[PDB]
Structure formats: structure tokens, C-alpha cells
From Swiss-Prot:
Free-text domain note: In the N-terminus, the macro domain displays a mono-ADP-ribosylhydrolase activity. The central part called, the alphavirus unique domain (AUD) has a zinc-binding function. The C-terminus region, also called hypervariable domain (HVD), is mainly disordered and binds several host proteins. This intrinsically disordered domain contains 2 SH3 domain-binding sites and 2 FGDF motifs necessary and sufficient for the formation of nsP3/G3BP complexes.
Protein name stated in the entry: Non-structural protein 3
Subunit record text: Interacts with mRNA-capping enzyme nsP1. Interacts (via C-terminus) with host G3BP1; this interaction inhibits the formation of host stress granules on viral mRNAs and the nsp3-G3BP1 complexes bind viral RNAs and probably orchestrate the assembly of viral replication complexes. Interacts (via C-terminus) with host G3BP2; this interaction inhibits the formation of host stress granules on viral mRNAs and the nsp3-G3BP2 complexes bind viral RNAs and probably orchestrate the assembly of viral replication complexes. Interacts (via C-terminus) with host NAP1L1.
Macro domain ranges (all copies): 3-162
Consequence of substituting residue 116 to V/W: Almost complete loss of mono-ADP-ribosylhydrolase activity
Membrane association type: Peripheral membrane protein
Role played: Seems to be essential for minus-strand RNAs and subgenomic 26S mRNAs synthesis. Displays mono-ADP-ribosylhydrolase activity. ADP-ribosylation is a post-translational modification that controls various processes of the host cell and the virus probably needs to revert it for optimal viral replication. Binds proteins of G3BP family and sequesters them into the viral RNA replication complexes thereby inhibiting the formation of host stress granules on viral mRNAs.
Residues of the full protein shown: 1334 to 1493 of 2474
Amino acid sequence: HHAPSYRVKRMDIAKNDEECVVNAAAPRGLPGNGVCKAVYKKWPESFKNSATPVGTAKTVMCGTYPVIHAVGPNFSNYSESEGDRELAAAYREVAKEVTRLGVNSVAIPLLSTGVYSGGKDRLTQSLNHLFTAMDSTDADVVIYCRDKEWEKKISEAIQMRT
Ligand SMILES: Nc1ncnc2c1ncn2[C@@H]1O[C@H](COP(=O)(O)OP(=O)(O)OC[C@H]2O[C@@H](O)[C@H](O)[C@@H]2O)[C@@H](O)[C@H]1O
């Protein structure tokens, strides 16, 4: 039957064409300045009781549209080793929620690569944890980014596995 795919698009994740969205969220459920800024503007209702611990995900419906609030670690606060573990765990919880929801597709950003990156380039680290979690799901995954060079690198990483 249908072949599950990965794609990357360089555009605002709030404009996605998928059946649900992943917010790069904060543990206290507060609006932020990255992805979460766009998510709060588009789906403010999904922030009712969206607070959840680092390394977890919590889904809140906006109408019937699921917003999966996934909380990556802030690497300014976490050690490299503990932050790596929590980043991986957040994506594992996203994969479980995508499965539970039965969606055919999900729009997802790269967790902990912006406000929570500790000032380091974490594209490969974050993308590889995304793959480790989402590879075993059969939803179409669309990765959203904003940087031109990151779009190219993410696309290369997807393509080199096919
Ligand atoms: N609207 C967007 N669409 C797609 N990608 C985006 C968007 N906005 C930012 N990005 C990119 O998404 C990636 C994740 O960065 P952040 O959204 O800043 O997420 P994170 O690093 O996990 O920090 C989360 C923290 O920031 C606050 O926005 C949020 O409330 C939380 O406190 C970065 O590469 C960023 O450049």
C-alpha cells in the first residue's frame, strides 16, 4: 500500500499541509519566540494545559486538529549527555503520539536546534533522533525548517537513505 515518506520544506510550520503538527514547546506551556510563536498564533486553543516535562510530549486538540507539544531540553541547562538523552526521548514520545492519533501525516520541526540549542549547531544530532523515533511509524513526515543551508542538509540526509 502507500509508501511512507519523509520530505523537508523551508517555510513556516504553521502553514503545513499535514494532519497534525509538532510544536517545539516549552515545559511550562508558555508561548515562545521560535516555532512556538507561530504555533501559538495559529492554534492558541492548543495551549490549554499544554505544560509537560522536558523529554515528553503532550497533545492538545485545536478543534479536531492535534498539536503535539514536544519539549526538547534547553542545552544551556542540561549537560551534553543528559540533554542528548532527553532530546531523544522527546522524539520517542512524538512517535507514540503520532501512532496513537492514527494520523496519516505529521509536520515536525527540529527540536532543541534554536532557542534551546545552547548556541551550538545541532541539526545532525536532532535530525538523527527524529529518524530514530519516527522511522518505525508509517505516517508521512514533513520536516519544516527556515534556514536555506539546513534545508539542503536535511534533504541530503533523507535522500541518502533511499
Ligand atoms: N515557524 C517555523 N517553522 C519552521 N521552523 C522554524 C520556525 N521557527 C523557527 N524555526 C526553526 O525551528 C527550529 C527549532 O527552534 P525553536 O522553535 O526555537 O525550538 P527549540 O530550540 O526546541 O526551543 C524551544 C523553546 O523556544 C520557544 O519558541 C519555545 O517556547 C521553547 O521555550 C530552529 O531551527 C528554528 O530556526
